[PDB]
């Protein structure tokens, strides 16, 4: 699906341009970026479907765009330089390609079904680490600050920390957090209550890099489940969904 | 102390390229960096003292060097690109200059007392956030994990999130975390069990940047205390401090 993949690449970094020059300044950009991507993909393929924030995440069987104009909202506002656009694409209720741009570091993350995953030219591949005790695991807080998700939050980290994890990292971006996964920079990821536009693109990439992406339970991924376990190995992934 | 400062700067940079180098492969470097700096400065200023990993943080009034060849050790071995070199300087029992160089993303942070703070030649200024509820806070698990130092991490964390804090960030580099604080991309920092060589250099940069660096307890910094609270505003430092 080249013309579309190319539309994704071309837009992800034009958006990525808009956000870099925006970060220099001292919600508008979001919409700007949103309405940029979605209006052009729209009347580029007027009959395609979309799934971005602006129930649920119900993926049909038709060619669907799954978009997050700005991932790293909060980071943006504090100008924490961990900000991203993520454009995923599905066909036949399968994830086709993904394109995730690190606006700051200028790293185009791409992933096509069966054709591998690359960051800036060269190929990516996960780690294969299977021993959780030797692993660097990623996760994120969340927008919602209810005492039930926050207790949750603290519950899973203890489990992961009592699971004897090498180190934990939370960077304010699930999209980039997972791209770290895909490239080997980390060995596992988890999170509850996260929308699927933050998931779609990263998954094809993580998969194409040789990794695994499942439901938190250890079962298969469920886009509407709003959760994830992404790992370097299905072993690692299993250890993580077990703990918690 | 112009002579000295450019000594660390050139070593932070020398060490850095070596780090970036060695990172390129697929901890002997840490020794290479340790020597790389302590050696030179040793010959250069043989009358000086060294505070480094090898009582520990007993600072006199003599001209003393506080060094961490590599901050972000676990990150190194994982290839997680959050690794830093730390060379701090004190004279007459006060912090004089600090130099921190994000090896990978190639940033040389510096700060000299009276002479403000910088990164790559641009003047740094703390954020100026006093509203803890609007704060991006950074911390670190730390070294040990013995249950003692691991349920504290979760008590602190739980407390912080409990205070309706914007977000939490752990990136696996104390000095880099603390540099973000200087830059303005974060609002505060807190940690229990971090050594002075991680903290000497950063405290200088945060101070010269307009930030406040204090003891965990709200009191002033006690370098032999292996703990810190740093923040954009004394206002913030308190709201954090009175959460702990």
Chain breaks in chain B (C to N over 2.5 A) after: 26, 54
- Asked whether A229 and A238 are in contact (CB, 8 A), the reply is no
A53 labeled part of a ligand binding site: yes
Please indicate whether residue B106 is annotated as part of the active site. Answer: no
DSSP string for residues in A12-33:
HHHHHHHHHHHHT---HHHHHH
Q: Which of A79, A172, A185 sits opposite B167 (nearest CB)?
A: A172
Which fold does the domain A1-124 belong to in CATH? Fructose-1,6-Bisphosphatase; Chain A, domain 1 (3.30.540)
Give the pair of three-digit tokens for residue A79: 């100008």
- What are the two backbone dihedrals, phi and then psi, of residue A44, each rounded to the nearest 5 degrees? -90, -45
Rounded to the nearest angstrom, the minimum Cα separation between A171 and chain B is 6
Look-up of token digits 């837009």: A11
Please indicate whether residue A198 is annotated as part of the active site. Answer: yes
Q: Which of A141, A167, A187 sits opposite B167 (nearest CB)?
A: A141
Which helix (H) or strand (E) segment holds residue A157: the answer is helix A147-162
B125-244 shares the fold of B1-124: no
Query: Cβ of B168 and A166 within 8 Å?
Result: no
- Cβ count within 10 A of residue B4: 19
What is the Cα–Cα distance from A90 to B7, expressed in whole angstroms? 55
- Asked whether B102 and B205 are in contact (CB, 8 A), the reply is no
**Adjacency order of strands within the sheet including A84-91:** A49-50, A64-71, A84-91, A94-102, A107-112, A117-119, A122-123
> HEC states along chain B?
CHHHHHHHHHHHHHHHHHHHHHHCCCCHHHHHHHHHHHHHHHHHCCCCEEEECCCCCCCCCCCEEEEEEEECHHHHHHCCCCCEEEEEEEECCEEEEEEEEECCCCEEEEEECCEEEEECCEECCCCCCCCHHHCEEECCCCCCCCCHHHHHHHHHHHHHHHCCCCEEEECCCHHHHHHHHHHCCCCEEEEECCCHHHCHHHHHHHHHHCCEEECCCCCECCHHHCEEEEECCHHHHHHHHCCC
What is the Cα–Cα distance from B141 to B152, expressed in whole angstroms? 9
What is the Cα–Cα distance from B42 to B36, expressed in whole angstroms? 10
Closest CA to B188 of A78, A143, A158, A173: A78
Q: In whole angstroms, how large is the CA radius of gyration of chain A?
A: 17
Q: What is the resolution of this structure in A?
A: 2.4
Please indicate whether residue B70 is annotated as part of the active site. Answer: yes
What is the Cα–Cα distance from B116 to B108, expressed in whole angstroms? 14
- Cβ count within 10 A of residue A86: 31
What is the Cα–Cα distance from B166 to A68, expressed in whole angstroms? 21
Give the pair of three-digit tokens for residue B212: 């406040």
- Which residues of chain A neighbour B136 with C-beta distances below 8 Å? 74-75, 78, 80, 172
- What are the two backbone dihedrals, phi and then psi, of residue A75, each rounded to the nearest 5 degrees? -50, -45
- Asked whether A192 and A149 are in contact (CB, 8 A), the reply is yes
A110 beta partners: A99, A118
Q: Which residues of B202-237 are buried (b: 16+ CB within 10 A; e: fewer)?
A: bbbbbbbbbbbbbbbeeeebebebbbbbbbbbeebb
Q: What single DSSP character describes residue A71? A: E
Per CATH, domain B125-244 is 3.40.50.720: no
Give the pair of three-digit tokens for residue B177: 């975390």
* A·B CB contacts under 8 A: 80
- Asked whether A98 and A196 are in contact (CB, 8 A), the reply is no
What region, left, alpha or beta, does residue A193 occupy, with left being phi > 0 and alpha being psi -120 to 50 degrees? left
CA B114 to chain CA mean position, Å: 19
Suggest the residue from A78, A122, A168 to mutate for an interface test with chain B (most B CBs closer than 10 A). A78
- Which residues of chain B neighbour A168 with C-beta distances below 8 Å? 141, 170
Sequence-ordered list of residues with C-beta below 8 angstroms from that of A25, at least 6 positions apart, any chain = none
Please indicate whether residue A146 is annotated as part of the active site. Answer: no
Beta strand B136-138 with B122-123: parallel, antiparallel or unpaired? Answer: unpaired
* Catalytic, out of B71, B140, B187, B208: B71
What Å distances lie between residue B203 and A189, B79, B82, B220, CA to CA?
A: 32, 27, 19, 12
Closest CA to B112 of B91, B83, B140, B128: B91
- Asked whether B220 and B241 are in contact (CB, 8 A), the reply is no
Beta strand A188-192 with A136-138: parallel, antiparallel or unpaired? Answer: parallel
Give the pair of three-digit tokens for residue A13: 């970094």
Domain boundary assignment for chain A = 1-124, 125-244
CA within 13 Å, CB half, A105: 21
What is the Cα–Cα distance from B211 to B206, expressed in whole angstroms? 5
Please indicate whether residue B198 is annotated as part of the active site. Answer: yes
- Asked whether A154 and B161 are in contact (CB, 8 A), the reply is yes
Rounded to the nearest angstrom, the minimum Cα separation between A130 and chain B is 14
Q: SS3 of A213, please?
A: strand
Q: SS3 of A116, please?
A: coil
Q: SS3 of A197, please?
A: helix
What region, left, alpha or beta, does residue A15 occupy, with left being phi > 0 and alpha being psi -120 to 50 degrees? alpha
Q: How was this structure determined?
A: X-ray
Closest CA to A70 of A183, A197, A224: A197
- Which residues of chain A neighbour B81 with C-beta distances below 8 Å? 185
Dihedral of alpha carbons B224, B225, B231, B233, sign: negative
- Asked whether B215 and B191 are in contact (CB, 8 A), the reply is no
| Cis amide prior to A36 (ω within 30 degrees) | no
Which helix (H) or strand (E) segment holds residue A68: the answer is strand A64-71
Query: Cβ of A187 and B161 within 8 Å?
Result: no
- What are the two backbone dihedrals, phi and then psi, of residue B28, each rounded to the nearest 5 degrees? -70, -25
Closest CA to A112 of A94, A126, A129, A92: A94
- Cβ count within 10 A of residue A122: 7
């Amino acid at each position: 699906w080249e013309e579309c993949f190319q539309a994704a690449v071309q837009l992800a970094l034009r958006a990525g341009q808009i956000i870099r020059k925006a970060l220099t300044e001292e919600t508008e950009t979001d919409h700007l970026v949103e309405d940029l991507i979605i209006s052009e993909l729209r009347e580029r393929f007027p009959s395609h479907r979309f799934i971005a924030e602006e129930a649920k995440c119900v993926l049909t069987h038709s060619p669907t765009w799954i978009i997050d104009p700005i991932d790293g909202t909060c980071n943006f506002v504090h100008r924490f330089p961990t900000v991203a656009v993520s454009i995923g694409f599905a066909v036949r209720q399968e994830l086709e390609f993904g394109v995730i741009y690190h606006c700051t570091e200028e790293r185009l993350y791409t992933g096509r079904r069966g054709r591998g995953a690359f960051c800036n030219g060269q190929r990516l591949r996960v780690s294969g680490e299977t021993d959780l005790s030797k692993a660097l695991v990623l996760t994120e807080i969340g927008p919602k600050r209810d005492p039930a998700t926050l207790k949750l939050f603290l519950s899973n980290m203890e489990r992961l920390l009592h699971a004897k994890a090498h180190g934990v990292r939370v960077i304010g971006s699930s999209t980039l957090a997972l791209c770290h996964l895909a490239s080997g920079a980390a060995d596992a990821y988890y999170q509850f209550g996260l929308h699927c536009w933050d998931l779609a693109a990263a998954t094809v990439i993580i998969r194409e890099a040789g990794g695994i992406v499942i439901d938190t339970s250890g079962g298969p991924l469920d886009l509407m489940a709003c959760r994830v376990v992404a790992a370097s190995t299905r072993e690692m992934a299993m250890l993580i969904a077990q703990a918690l």
